Design goal:
Belongs to the class-A beta-lactamase family. Its EC number is 3.5.2.6. Keywords: Antibiotic resistance, Disulfide bond, Hydrolase, Plasmid, Signal. GO terms for molecular function: beta-lactamase activity. There is one protein chain. The protein has helices at 2-14, 46-57, 92-101, 105-114, 118-127, 156-167, 174-185, 247-258, and strands at 17-24, 29-33, 39-40, 67-70, 88-91, 153-154, 203-211, 215-223, 230-237. It is an alpha+beta fold. It has one domain (1-261): DD-peptidase/beta-lactamase superfamily (Beta-lactamase, 3-Layer(aba) Sandwich), CATH 3.40.710. The strands form 3 sheets. The chain has a 5-stranded antiparallel β-sheet with strand order 2-1-9-8-7, with helices on both faces. Strands 3-6 form a two-stranded antiparallel sheet. A two-stranded antiparallel ribbon has the order 4-5.
Length: 261
């Protein structure tokens, strides 16, 4: 399609490797660019950890109100919210919100611990039918994004389908699903990524991710005004370990996708 030629040209112009998956829920059509290649997830993995905790809360009805102590030793490299509560507590709801909306890394590590380690996050993916997702490490080492390293990767296609199920489908209970959507819609880190390539009238819930090798990711559910929602995943990584983030590539990919619907 025109769209795949424009995405290829965007990729060529950027010097990196771009992965795109769009699901149009109106007709269940998909647009894929390197849809089955593995990319480092970086912080986009935090959606799976938060959703796993939500699934637990379907049976443990009070789980999200469970206080969790934040100790100094828990702090890693980026903890904008956990920092505010060192030597105090945050609930599992507050840690989930912090992990999603501020990309707090300490918060993500507490979610992983609640699930029994990275294997517990991966297990939830498998449980909802995602055989591709793999979480192997905790924060911050899951962001190393080494070329060829399959740790802490997924594919655009897999992540798109899983994000659809978590937000628009029924992998989660009704209250949990609504809470996840509310969290994604209130993301604070996404203004320069997919959101920047879309009409301002559209509602977007997203989770960004960044890591080494200039890895720059965004996964989003999109609610156009008067039109079925879309799921869009944009993964981007570069050949230099110290490359700078390229959120503009994600905005441009979203703009190209938006041209055609």
């Amino acid at each position: 399609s025109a769209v795949q030629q424009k995405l290829a040209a965007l990729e060529k112009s950027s010097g990196g490797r771009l992965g795109v998956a769009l699901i149009d829920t109106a007709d269940n059509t998909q647009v894929l660019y390197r849809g089955d290649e593995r990319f480092p997830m970086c912080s986009t993995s935090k959606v799976m950890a938060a959703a796993a905790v939500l699934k637990q809360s379907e049976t443990q009805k009070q789980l999200l109100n469970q206080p969790v102590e934040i100790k100094p030793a828990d702090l890693v490299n980026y903890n904008p919210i956990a920092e505010k509560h060192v030597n105090g507590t945050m609930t599992l709801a507050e840690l989930s919100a912090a992990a999603l909306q501020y990309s707090d890394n300490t918060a993500m590590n507490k979610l992983i611990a609640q699930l029994g380690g990275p294997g517990g996050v991966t297990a939830f993916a498998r449980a909802i039918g995602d055989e591709t997702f793999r979480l192997d490490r905790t924060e911050p080492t899951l962001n190393t994004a080494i070329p060829g390293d399959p740790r802490d990767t997924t594919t655009p296609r897999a992540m798109a389908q899983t994000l659809r199920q978590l937000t628009l489908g029924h992998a989660l209970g009704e209250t949990q699903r609504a809470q996840l959507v509310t969290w994604l819609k209130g993301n604070t880190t996404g203004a320069a990524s997919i959101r920047a390539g879309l009409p301002t009238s559209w509602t977007v819930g997203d989770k960004t991710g960044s890591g080494d090798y200039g890895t720059t990711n965004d996964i989003a559910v999109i609610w156009p005004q008067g039109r079925a929602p879309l799921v869009l995943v944009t993964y981007f990584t570069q050949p230099q370990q110290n490359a700078e983030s390229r959120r503009d590539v994600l905005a441009s990919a979203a703009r190209i996708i938006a041209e055609g619907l």
